[model samples]
Target: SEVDLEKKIQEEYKLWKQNVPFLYDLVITEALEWPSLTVEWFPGSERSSIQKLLLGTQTSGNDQNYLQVASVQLPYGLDIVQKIHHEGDVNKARFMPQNPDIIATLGLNGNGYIFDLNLYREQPIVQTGHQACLRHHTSEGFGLGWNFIQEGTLATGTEDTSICVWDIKGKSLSLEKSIDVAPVSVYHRHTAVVNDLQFHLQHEALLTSVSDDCTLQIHDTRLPSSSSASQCVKAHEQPVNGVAFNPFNDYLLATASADHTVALWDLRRLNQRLHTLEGHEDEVYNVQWSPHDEPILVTSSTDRRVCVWDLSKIGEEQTVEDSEDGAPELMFMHGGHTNRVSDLSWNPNNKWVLASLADDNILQIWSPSKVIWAS
Candidate 1:
């Protein structure tokens, strides 16, 4: 009876495979000429009729960078809704979680700025009265994060080996708390540039920062200043460039590193890695989990390819070594860019839509389609 059941299940699978359509088909629907280092979609509006995208780009004439916020109208054209220039190259930019009209940016000049789209057309709201004040980072600012639960709260990481939390009031930003390198402490501090910072989806006080020192550190804002860290792990052999928590699973974390691998971790047990996804031919630059799916994610690399990984095929009880032979299945591999793919953002409202930025002076939008299945 057991053998008969197995055969029946196999037969059903074959029929399903033949009749059902693939989950998604990767398609490049549109492309923009703007050369960007980072791109993000306005959350909560991905599924809406109109979509907006925020791009961080450097000017062609000089090296000066700018934040180009635009409205993406399909079948028509991309319109520049707002443009703000920075004296230094913009390393990263993000739309405020609670307020889409506001955006925060970090630059190589080691300063942070906030822009109110509704109020200012050209000038950004001043953070400090001094024209060249070092109120934020002493070195280049590289990473940015917005606290989802705490309104008007933002975090920035920089090459100065520090993380600064800021509180927004009216139009300006004020320093709320500063986490600097602890030279005396043997743990929970980065000695090199901080690459990226991300706040936890559910926990407002929980924040994660990755660094060039090859470590991932988790900090609880509620902890006293004397506390070292909530948890710290030697995440990668090379610099960890990006770190993001799973939207569906509060305890799962994903990290991309220069070691040419993307590793998934279970925060419940940090002693071991849950999965080491290996496929990139060069250093991995960034990794992001899909907001719509628990097991789907995208990883970009210097290898000039963006790989979409599906982890549902891996068994829950399988070890990291078990996946060595059969790595996570690459649902799709996009090779449209001639240069290295820098970053990727998935539409929060539409699961099948994705946007990727490349060094080849192109920002492409991808829309995957699926066949209709009959009942």
Candidate 2:
């Protein structure tokens, strides 16, 4: 039975690969215009690769029926792909998140395009909606920060220091909220530029945003009006590029910054920094917590290595002299990238499986079980 199933899955992948060879090569070779990607699995399927697209496969015992679902396309090959994607060059690509059968894209020109992916053809859904809010007007570093909040709602962050919410069904856009700087550069605040935004997994009503302004903003989605200001915290000393919340602990949040540091925040303390995590010599690009283990945090930096930090000991100290018995430790460091590691992600279903993307167009998968050794 196992052999039959494997045979069927392979056959199906072969067929799928044949059907979408162009997309696969485009995604794998970094020829696609999009730069960032995220993927999800089908209800009853195992992960598979066909061309450049990640597929979820399902097979019945009878071998009579095999199903395949196409997921998102990643930007580059897995090496040093992040550098080419993050150059902030006008000619480079800008991307937005998409749902099955629907896609969106925008660039430095302050224009947006939507597509219907199911028609066996690309169709535009929205060409333009709102005017540019910021004066610099070259489009944000990565274009609209689009993400799916729920079945019918989408959220986007822009260079205007504003977050916009959209009703996919109604095709309506509204300013959910905006961030304000005390007094500095209005065009590009010495303190802030909207860098990244993410919604809480458990609490869909709450959203977190990081900015070049060196602060994080937490807002309540239940509020109907923008007049209700967000709860702000001076999170980092320098511009923050990425922010993430622990899937297992709502009180815990992590932020990575150009200041060459990653810090954990405990929201219960009015946005107090719980731990100043350090190991990388270059700007930290992304920080992710293992879904299987909250105490395990993985971060990728411009230094080209992906470091794993274990935060089991909440407040214990690990001295250079070794006075503590069970202090949190820097568990492992994975190095192979020729360029900066732009993003790192932990497999949701597999605790030991980790993936990283770099600027050289490489994608690497690592398993802790296969780790050789560490000091």
Candidate 3:
């Protein structure tokens, strides 16, 4: 029976690929040596033939974990240009918004480290060449983000049911021994695991977090660590797995959850869902608002589908044949991954370009056929 099911899955995959020529305008799959836990694009405004991605290696054996900056040559190929040996299987890695060379990573042990990728390029010095040892959480953390409005501020959320805000204005990087760093403030408002956090697009001191407690909480870093959150919303009946502040609009936000759905929220009226996305067959794990399109949102899930939503089309009258599925906002769906998609990031340099990482260690860079998003 298991073999029969596997065969059926493969047969379906073959059928999906049969339309590849018409389905995707451009797509490439990068088989990785080690699966990545997170994927981030290097910030840029201009488009080019090549771009780099920030990733962390997840290893199960004695293999060394690393922070890798991989070069993706468009029209297709993935090549590793830089590799920095890291402390452990990096749970997540993000480059500083102000300086891409200054990288930060959350280690599996709950501690984090900041490194200047240039150090390895400048000279062959020491190992674990970290600049600062970010320590606070007693348990491992997965939530990490940089404040877009502020150059040196960042936040981390942990299973310890707390969030730590750090402001490393001019900290020095060292391998002599990692410079011990401390959080500027710590907040204890979430009663359950803090799944994700993001800084507001316009506000420097405000941030948001989604939790297993099924709530979305907003915190003001200016407030005392002992103070409660400024506002909270019952975001989902199940754990909220991801959250993203819309890059094009400060008022709009998106949350992905274990409730098998994704929902949008308007910060001005946080009491009710702005719009509920209705097509994911399994728990949605991540959501991202496109930097280039105001109404476009993308959600990836365990269901092996990455659905794209265009808010502007939410109530459009459909053609008779298209009325069957009936999700007006669902513009296109990517069914290329054989396993659950773990993370995805929108490429800022190229409009509509997306990169998705899956449990199968397949990193795919793709874009829907222009017919889907073209004006």
Candidate 4:
């Protein structure tokens, strides 16, 4: 059976190598002067002529960390609209889904700030309120995400092994509460830094978080305090850095880790991995599913490479021996960044447009042409 499976995989790989054209092509590369750690695309208007982007830069040497929000006027260059200086390294920045003009940023100082793109002010529109018995993290804030279903709900992960939920509605944003996953006490949450947090696209109350503890936990905000998380998995041997729910399939998800592997999982069957995509030589920093295609996945790594995978070729429970060793159909390996590729974001308006940021202070925009292949 193993020999037969190996032969089948070889045949498939050969066919794919011959049929698939080189899809990913470099379109634009820009040096921001500041080493950026994270980047995100603003929700583009169907009516607007240009798309907007956000870059979260880290402090290098004596430079100040900043968040640069810019509008991309294609065939030309990026026009910077706003620049907000951060107190420390900016770990994450995101444009609110409901209002793209409202951007939220988190810094290593553990504080979160909200800015209105329409308003040009020296200070943030709303500093996260400390009143109402609200407080910020004691350590660095690493991950930030807005709820997919809820209009004003926002979540942030911290190095203190805590995840804070905030309600950003009116004059000022107030902390809803902190969800402590530390195992020092009674709770059985993560004992290490929570690297990333994401709310389920369809489920309003369902939240997922990955941590340096090498575990992934799913929490339901609607549940009673005693029973918050519905499921937990020892996701990887090393620190799990990123997790993303498939935009097309609610039950399927992907995780990137320091183990240099990206794993696909079925929420319906968590006992075994659905697919283990291995190609990177170093830790995989981020994994993102395409907004338009169900089987298209892109990953960034510390190996200084960004890879795209087409998972449509592998059938569910297909007879593939050592599937962990079996590589998925790699659409392209992009080696545009000089340093470690930290993060990547796909354009919500354009299916093929992708933006990536790296430690080299370089930002690259790629628009890979789609090519249909014969089976």
Candidate 5:
């Protein structure tokens, strides 16, 4: 009997398919900020059936809501819906956890506004930073504060190099605690702008932050004292752009840096680098760990390529030796944008779906496809 090579190959392909998942492509559009990042999906949508486009405007004091440009009815692209012009220049926007009706927006003016999405009303939340009676600090204010630790509790990172914890209990935001990251002593050599902040999903008291200082700081947000009790290894050589804790593993953190590399750090040890991933030639603007799969990391950059990486074989010595090179396995690279990618987010409801924004003013959603390949 002749050997059935086709059947045998099919069996091996099935095993490979199980090991490495595939991705598909959706239609792309010029629907967002220039350098096109700045997009978010509705928090409480059926991920498999529909798409709701929430566009974030770049200009400050523009008198706009993140501009709910359209409510995509799914599989077909975005549909024009009622536009909601809220307030402030929305650099980033997030829907409040546990309350689908509430959304929080961060602006360039350092103001955090909490709005009722259903009623479309901006509630007067508590503002941070009391003016000094003597000298006034130039451009002092709060920037990003949506959700970090838990529902109703917001974690805000400012240009002042400080992160404040805000508790929105009932009709107001109360300061829970604050942690400053300025270089106060020789041991704490931190002189950079804190850009991104995120709370560990598994550990509410643990918050991770990235900055222009070229380092990542892990703060313990336990009430009574939010001191910088813990930290990770210095994971980047340049300004850190994005920081995210693994949805499955709280100990693993991924940081995007201006050095064109995304590094994965182990939080337990603050002195060692876990993995340094390099592929993008330009600054890595954003990095997001898939909510469904912790090992899958999505990174966007000024190079205009959204690369997805699988960290499962990252630390494996055999795979490392097999290549005899530093290049990690490239899962897929979707041609992201022609300009700088500002922000990106994965759909919480669907693991295979993702969104990226940039200078092109286009919001793009990438879906999984049968062809396992890179762009």
Candidate 6:
């Protein structure tokens, strides 16, 4: 049965690849030796044709895992420019918003490590281990976020049913060798796994998280954890995996859930749902708001499809045949991965460009054709 399933999915990919020219304005896919659980675009993408990316090898074998710094030229080739031997499989990794030189990553062990790329520039492209550790979570973790407005401040959520916020204020980024920093605060409001975490787009101290507890919780980092979350909403019947704040509106949030639906929430009206996007046949893994377009957002799923959504297209008229398919907000669907999509990122420098990684060892960079997504 597994063989047959693989054959079927392989055929699907064959057809999808066959139509690439018709579907995309630009696309480049790379087959990796080991799949990456996370992929993040570097800042300043518009400055040049070359763009940098952060990725961590999720190796299943006895083979070594690596913290990979990769590069790609628009609609062209790809390469792993820097690779450091990591301790274990990285579950999630993010670059610090204030400084891309600082990378925070999580593993199965509770200890989350930070790697300073400045060392690589300072000449440790040969380095092996992390420069510092955020020692707090008692178990594995998936949720991680960096504060955009506050330097050296970040939050992480763990399977231990806790969330830890760390602020290494004026801390030395120049580690002599290695060290450990404990969390400044911890929250214990979630009863189950904290799957994802995000900071408010413009708010300096507001943080939001989603969990297997089937709820979305907002915490004021400035307040003590014992005071409870500032806002708690049961966001879905099933566990929510990812939460993305609207860059244009501090009060709006988009959450991806195992319910096979993505929902937009108005933080102002805690009880009401703004929009529920549908079409995915399996659990949604992650969702990211577009950086250049306020109305556009994208979702990745175990269904092996990347879906694009537009809030502004919510009430647009559609043909009866199209209406029967699903939500009007489902602007486009990219079915390219032959396996489950693990994560996705929107290119801030190029409108409509997106990068997605899959369990099939495929990382795809693509933009929809102007013929379909007209300006």
The TM-score, computed over Cα atoms with residue i paired to residue i, of candidate 3 is 0.95
Tell me how far the alpha carbon of residue 104 in candidate 5 is from the true structure, in angstroms, after superposition: 1.3
User: Which parts of model 3 are misplaced by more than 4 Å?
Assistant: 1-4, 45-48, 122-127
CA lDDT, every model vs. true structure? 0.72, 0.51, 0.86, 0.73, 0.60, 0.86
Query: Model 4, range 240-318, lDDT digits (tens) per residue?
Result: 9999999999999999999999988998786788889888999998999988788888999987778888887665453
Which residue runs does candidate 5 get wrong by more than 4 Å? Answer: 1-25, 32-37, 46-48, 60-69, 121-149, 172-190, 223-226, 315-328, 373-375
lDDT of 5 by residue, 238-261 (tens): 888888778788688888889999
How displaced is residue 182 in candidate 4, in Å? Answer: 19
Poorest 10 consecutive residues of model 4 by lDDT?
178-187
lDDT of 6 by residue, 246-325 (tens): 89877888999999999899898878898898899999989999888788889989999999887787878889998898
Kindly list the per-residue Cα lDDT of model 2 for residues 20-94, writing each as its tens digit.
Answer: 432222323232223233322211223343112221111112221111122332322332211111111221122
Measured with C-alpha atoms, the lDDT of residue 29 in candidate 5 is 49
The backbone clash count of each candidate, in order, is 0, 24, 2, 0, 21, 0
lDDT of 3 by residue, 28-56 (tens): 88889999988999975324478889887
List ranges where model 2 is wrong by over 4 Å: 1-44, 47-117, 121-138, 141-149, 170-191, 224-228, 313-327, 370-375
Model 3 global lDDT (CA atoms, 0 to 1): 0.86
Sorted by TM-score, highest first, which candidate order results?
A: 6, 3, 4, 1, 5, 2
Roughly what TM-score does model 1 have, to 2 decimal places?
A: 0.79
- Which candidate, 3 or 5, would have the higher TM-score against the true structure? 3
RMSD of each: 10.5, 14.0, 2.0, 8.4, 10.8, 1.7
TM-score, per-candidate, Cα-based: 0.79, 0.62, 0.95, 0.80, 0.75, 0.96
In candidate 5, how many clashes are counted?
A: 21
